[PDB]
């Protein structure tokens, strides 16, 4: 097509109308452009707008196409008012309030359609499943005005006779019936059914949810509501052995199942054993201890490393309070036993606050506590989907405090938020805001024990850096070592007689991380990946710092109390729901890093975060 010509265009220029056309073959697209053109003019009050012809012509030798359209334009009409009548259900106030307009407003066909949809939507809340609403426009040319009449027939109230589910081969029927707001034996509400659709999507157990409202062949006023779902395969067994002569026996395994045999329970079993580290975790929860939404769950864990050992338990109870808002709280206990601790300044500052007096640069030491705690939190979640959100936001605020009788006295609070906002109507172009903040502290002269410190960097927070490397680094004291003959520039007993910096991260009691990601369509890949492959572009920032680091005593070292040392990076990432679970592939480059930082630009890990 070399040229599209619009003949008789006087209200607008050619380019203004061409700007909205999909054509720049003519097949099918032409009808879409003609409908766009009609709506474009109708939205400006051109009550008499008409398309007279649509010639399509071939150029010589079929080397091109020439497209011309003949347009007849009228004047601009004003809408004087709207009259509504017919067999109304009595809800005249809502219809009149929706219909009311400012008199003299430029006639707009779209607002008329809106009024029609708003009336049907209104009637759908009181059980009128099949109303009939038809606009009857009238044109008064003498005054360049229009008037509207609406023919409304509310119809009958409909009741739901049964609710049936199809396509659930594993999930227990009780699960599908919990996330419902339409009850059997009561009048139909269209919005209540849509809420049920959204809740089923939010469970995260299905690839898709379809709905239908089939009329009952045996009666004029009953409806059979049907949901169809397609179950997602989630939760995978992991087992493996890594035997060799360097490490001997190396065992790992676990179960990470979000829906256990389709019964509604979530279970996490994880563990591993090797010559130096031991780890085990068990986490079990029931989203519905009670039928009305009270949940229960908890976890047990054990680990050690040869140097520390720790273990503990916790139990959490929680419940919804306002549909989109829920609360959690619980109790727990942890044992922490340390040995052979390195002579670090931050660690010993803490130990001093606890009343300890370790010998200088002497690793022949130990320390252990038993700490009972209380934890709590609040969650907000109005997302439309479990894996690829398009709208809504999520806010997760959690924290914990010690209770009397514990060895430590501290508190910790974290805040994890994300917001998805669509850009285009197809929800393929979306902007994602992702943020995290946190802070902890101590009481009575003590500080938060170092094993609870925050870390940042890695695929879960700030991309492009090595995991747990963002933040203050260890500073060592210069006593004896059985390793020097494995050493460190600051650790050697003979080669170091003063303090110096190393690359060991210690974390800190406060952090902030933020990023912006743009979600884009993937037209390069087959459509069967539309619900499994997503790509994005992103820009990350973050910072971690150590509250009350004493800059007056260690003046030859950076002042770790200044939070302004913001680290920045950006890159590209791919999200894929693989047959075996979500995977995250990314590459990013830094914009700004500080002395001691360590980079890692190519990253790959599991997701299930944020």
């Amino acid at each position: 097509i070399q040229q599209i010509n619009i003949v008789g265009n006087h209200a607008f220029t050619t380019d203004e109308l061409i700007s909205h056309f999909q054509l720049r073959y003519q097949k099918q697209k032409l009808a879409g452009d003609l409908e766009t053109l009609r709506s474009y003019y109708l939205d400006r009050g051109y009550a008499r707008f008409n398309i007279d012809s649509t010639q399509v012509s071939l150029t010589p030798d079929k080397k091109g196409i020439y497209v011309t359209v003949n347009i007849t334009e009228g004047d601009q009409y004003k809408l004087s008012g709207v009259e509504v009548s017919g067999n109304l259900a009595g809800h005249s106030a809502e219809i009149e309030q929706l219909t009311k307009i400012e008199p003299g407003e430029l006639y707009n066909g779209t607002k008329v359609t809106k009024m029609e949809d708003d009336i049907k939507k209104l009637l759908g809340r009181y059980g009128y499943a099949y109303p009939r609403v038809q606009s009857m426009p009238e044109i008064n040319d003498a005054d360049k005005t229009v008037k509207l009449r609406v023919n409304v027939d509310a119809g009958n109230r409909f009741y739901v006779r049964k609710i049936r589910f199809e396509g659930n081969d594993t999930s227990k029927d009780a699960v599908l019936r919990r996330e419902m707001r339409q009850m059997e034996g009561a009048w139909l509400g269209s919005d209540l059914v849509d809420q049920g659709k959204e809740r089923l999507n939010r469970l995260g157990f299905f690839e898709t949810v379809d709905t239908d409202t089939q009329r009952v062949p045996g009666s004029p006023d009953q409806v059979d509501v049907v949901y169809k779902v397609k179950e997602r395969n989630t939760g995978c067994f992991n087992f493996g052995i890594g035997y060799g002569t360097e490490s001997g026996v190396s065992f790992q395994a676990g179960v990470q199942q979000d829906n256990w045999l389709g019964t509604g329970y979530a279970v996490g079993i994880n563990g591993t054993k090797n010559d130096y580290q031991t780890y085990a975790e068990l986490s079990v929860t029931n989203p519905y201890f009670t039928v009305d939404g009270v949940s229960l769950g908890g976890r047990l864990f054990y680990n050690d490393f040869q140097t520390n050992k720790s273990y503990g338990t916790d139990v959490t109870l929680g419940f919804p309070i306002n549909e989109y808002n829920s609360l959690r709280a619980g109790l727990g206990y942890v044992h922490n036993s340390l040995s052979n601790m390195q002579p670090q300044v931050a660690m010993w500052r803490y130990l001093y606050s606890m009343g300890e007096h370790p010998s200088t640069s002497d690793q022949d030491n130990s320390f252990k506590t038993d700490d009972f705690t209380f934890n709590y939190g609040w969650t907000y979640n109005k997302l439309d989907r479990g894996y690829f959100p398009t709208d809504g936001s999520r806010v997760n605020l959690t924290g914990k405090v010690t209770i009397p009788g514990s060895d430590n006295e501290y508190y910790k609070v974290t805040l994890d938020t994300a917001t998805y906002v669509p850009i285009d109507d197809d929800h393929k172009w979306v902007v994602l805001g992702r943020t995290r903040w946190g802070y902890g502290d101590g009481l009575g002269g003590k500080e938060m024990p170092f094993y609870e410190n925050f870390y940042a960097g890695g695929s879960s927070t700030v991309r492009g850096f090595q995991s747990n490397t963002i933040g203050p680094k260890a500073v060592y004291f210069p006593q004896a070592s059985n390793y020097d003959p494995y050493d460190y520039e600051c650790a050697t007993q003979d080669g170091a007689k003063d303090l110096c910096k190393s690359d060991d991260a210690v974390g800190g009691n406060a952090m902030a991380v933020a990023s912006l990601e743009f979600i884009t369509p993937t037209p390069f890949i087959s459509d069967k990946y539309a619900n499994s492959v997503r790509t994005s572009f992103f820009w990350d920032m973050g910072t971690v710092w150590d509250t009350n680091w004493d800059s007056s005593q260690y003046s030859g070292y950076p002042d770790y109390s200044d939070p302004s040392n913001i680290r920045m990076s950006a890159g590209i990432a791919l999200q894929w729901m693989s047959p075996l679970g979500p995977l995250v592939f990314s590459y990013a480059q830094p914009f700004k890093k500080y002395d001691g930082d360590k980079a890692e630009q190519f990253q790959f890990n599991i997701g299930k975060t944020w």
Partner: peptide
């Protein structure tokens, strides 16, 4: 399908998704 095994001293492992 939906199952993976490997053997690779050794790194034998497998995954089975529900």
């Amino acid at each position: 399908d939906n199952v993976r095994f490997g053997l690779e001293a050794v790194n034998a492992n497998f995954r089975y998704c529900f």
